[PDB]
């Protein structure tokens, strides 16, 4: 609560999921866990709490997924409500991508484009 | 869970816009990010979340990162913490990524590099200089 407009989380797009799951534990020593059930890989790139947050400031977890939606990596803004936001982005010339979608019981999810073409992603908490 | 050392954290990340004016209004409306100008860095500063002294984050759960013209920057960018760009560089070509442009020192604190992974997507490094 009161994050609104904070940059969040991040998605990295693949083409092939082993490949990519095992460059980036390879590269960086991310833990990184498929989730069959929500159709996404989780990825850990610092320390987290008992609730799976971050325990310390100035980083952020994230996820890949098959390349689609998301065609190049998004990072993503937490808002209160996802159709609120997405009419505030149309208004100031941005585009709906993908309007609000549930992710697990976890919360909800969006794409736009911004100003400049940009694909960027939007969370609302549950 | 544990990782290799203090590094590999995502800690910044870069839109590029076509329009800075344009773009830069987007955010500031759309959010609220505050962003400024750096004289003379060719770069925006975005702060999505408070800072403390240090100007570096001080609330967890997020980070701030940068707006700049599109040209090294061609789509978002996000940028992984690393002990050395030369070492991570290294061991992500062995791994099937390539160098897009090599360690690069920006403004006074630190080194910037741009890689593809194994999947095509750009990605950054940062490199705090010690």
Known sequence: QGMTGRIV???????DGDRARAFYRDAFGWA???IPDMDYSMVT???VGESGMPDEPG???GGM???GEVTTPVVT???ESIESALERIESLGGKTVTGRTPVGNMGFAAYFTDSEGNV????ETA
């Open 9 to 15: 989380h991040f998605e990295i797009p693949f083409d």
């Open 32 to 34: 990184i866990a498929e």
């Open 45 to 47: 790139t610092g320390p």
């Open 59 to 61: 980083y952020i977890n």
């Open 65 to 67: 997924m098959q390349r």
């Open 77 to 79: 803004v937490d808002v």
């Open 120 to 123: 960027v992603g939007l969370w």
